[PDB]
Design a protein around this ligand. Structure first.
Ligand code: HEM
Length: 82
């Protein structure tokens, strides 16, 4: 089964309590990863609540980084918002 979230729901997760973002139509909860992120937390907080695909790809992440990201996926962007 797959859980779908709308852009409306996602934008609400951009506070000290929760940090969600979208990458290639998948929704990632990075709340607990902010402080472990090699690239820093500021770069992640600035994209919170929205689609950060271009920025993610812009910094060209390694295979290990991409494999690790999967553990934070909690769902996908609703087809109607794509
Ligand atoms: C949720 C997925 C993410 C994971 C697991 C992750 C993981 C990592 C890891 C492991 C590195 C070290 C280098 C590498 O392996 O590529 C890295 C570096 C970096 N990440 Fe992420 N990252 C994530 C999302 C993002 C996003 C959303 C942005 C920006 C919008 C970002 C910006 C950067 C930057 C600036 C660096 C340093 C690049 C450099 O120094 O040249 N990351 N990330």
């Amino acid at each position: 089964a797959v859980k779908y979230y709308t852009l409306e729901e996602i934008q609400k997760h951009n506070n000290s309590k929760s940090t969600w973002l979208i990458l290639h139509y998948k929704v990632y909860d990075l709340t607990k990863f902010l402080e472990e992120h090699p690239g820093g937390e500021e770069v992640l907080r600035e994209q919170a609540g929205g689609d950060a695909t271009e920025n993610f790809e812009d910094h060209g992440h390694s295979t290990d980084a991409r494999e690790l990201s999967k553990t934070f996926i909690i769902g996908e962007l609703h087809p109607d918002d794509r």
